[PDB]
Each structure stands twice: as C-alpha cells, then as structure tokens.
C-alpha cells in the first residue's frame, strides 16, 4: 500500500526526528508508463 511506502524510514536526524519517504515524495499507484491514453467513442477506454 502507498501507506507503507510512505513510512519508509530514510534517515533519523541528530535530534531524533524521523525523515520518512512521504516527507520527500508523493506516493501513488500510477502507470508504469504514462504514454498511452485510449478513448472509445470519446469516453475513457483501455483495451488489448
């Protein structure tokens, strides 16, 4: 889940604070690639 990726402990600072992955990036399910976008009769599609 995105929730677990976000709590990835990148580094623990000198004061004890915790820099988590969610503190330095946005974490979402999303396309392996973002190149291909299909429409069937105008409306959002996918397919084979």
């Amino acid at each position: 889940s995105t929730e677990e990726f976000g709590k990835i402990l990148l580094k623990v600072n000198q004061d004890g604070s915790r820099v988590l992955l969610r503190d330095v990036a946005k974490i979402e399910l999303g396309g392996e690639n973002y190149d291909i976008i299909a429409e069937f009769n105008g409306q959002p599609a996918s397919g084979l």
Binding site: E3, G6, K7, R18, L20, R22
Partner: protein, 156 residues
C-alpha cells in the same frame, strides 16, 4: 494432550460451532494448547469466531491465557479487528493492559492496524495509553508514524 483437545483446537480454529458445542458437551479441554501455546480461545480470538469465543469462555476457558511469546486472545482480537470478541473478552475479564514479550499491548496492535473502535473500547475498559513497547513507542507513536490522524486525536 487428548484426542478431544486436538479436535477442539481444530474446530475452534475452523469455526465449526456445533462441533465445539458437542465437544463442550463431552468435557474436551478448553485449556488444550497447540504446538505454540495457542489455546482454542486464541484460535477463536484470532480467526474471528465470536460464538465459539463465548461458548469457550462459558465453559471455563482462560481469557488471559498467553502463548510462547506472550500474546493473549485479546492481543489477537485487538490486532485482527474483532470488535465484538474484544468486547466479550474484556467483559469476561481480559487484561486490556496485557503486554506480550515485546511489551506490545492490545492498544499498540489496535492502534497499529488502525482499529479506531477497538482502540476506544480498549480505552473505555482502561487501556493504558502511555504504555510503551520494547522500543518505547506508545499507541500514539504508532498513530503519528502510520499517518492516522483520527487515531492520533482519539489518543489525544
């Protein structure tokens, strides 16, 4: 060990209520433990089998049994989200502030898997919210790290 206590461990896990009923009719062992210390209440508490939970407790099952590393059926229930079992168990005297061998508490486990109701119930029955685990984390700490703000609020 007994023929029946193993049959009861099996039926408890599987949720075969009438098997459990017949087994309880025959004095099968409510204290039978499997290879790792789990009693059938454990099995029920983990696998989410409310009926059997009650039946077992009604038949002298120990609600505060603990496994090879300290887990109490409350631990299991709080952790896997079985609100009703939590309530029953605590009604029947389940130590809400039980610590396993990591110093983990049903609050911790519940905080962690984020079972807000189960948190509040446990808090209702007096879950020490300033309890710390092996590493000093309080259910709040689990809550801020998991990013759960409602939980964070409930634990104030």
């Amino acid at each position: 060990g007994s023929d029946l206590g193993k049959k009861l461990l099996e039926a408890a896990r599987a949720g075969r209520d009438d098997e459990v009923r017949i087994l309880m009719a025959n004095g099968a062992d409510v204290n039978a433990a499997d290879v790792v210390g789990w009693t059938p209440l454990h099995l029920a508490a983990y696998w989410g089998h409310l009926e059997i939970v009650e039946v077992l407790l009604k038949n002298g099952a120990d609600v505060n049994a603990y496994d090879t590393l300290g887990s109490t059926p409350l631990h299991l229930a709080a952790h896997f989200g079985h609100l009703e079992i939590v309530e029953v168990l605590l009604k029947n005297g389940a130590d809400v502030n039980a610590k396993d061998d990591n110093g983990i508490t049903p609050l911790h486990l519940a905080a962690n898997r984020g079972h807000l109701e189960i948190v509040e119930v446990l808090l209702k029955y007096g879950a020490d919210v300033n309890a710390q685990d092996k590493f000093g984390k309080t259910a709040f700490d689990i809550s801020i790290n998991n990013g759960n703000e409602d939980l964070a609020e409930i634990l104030q």
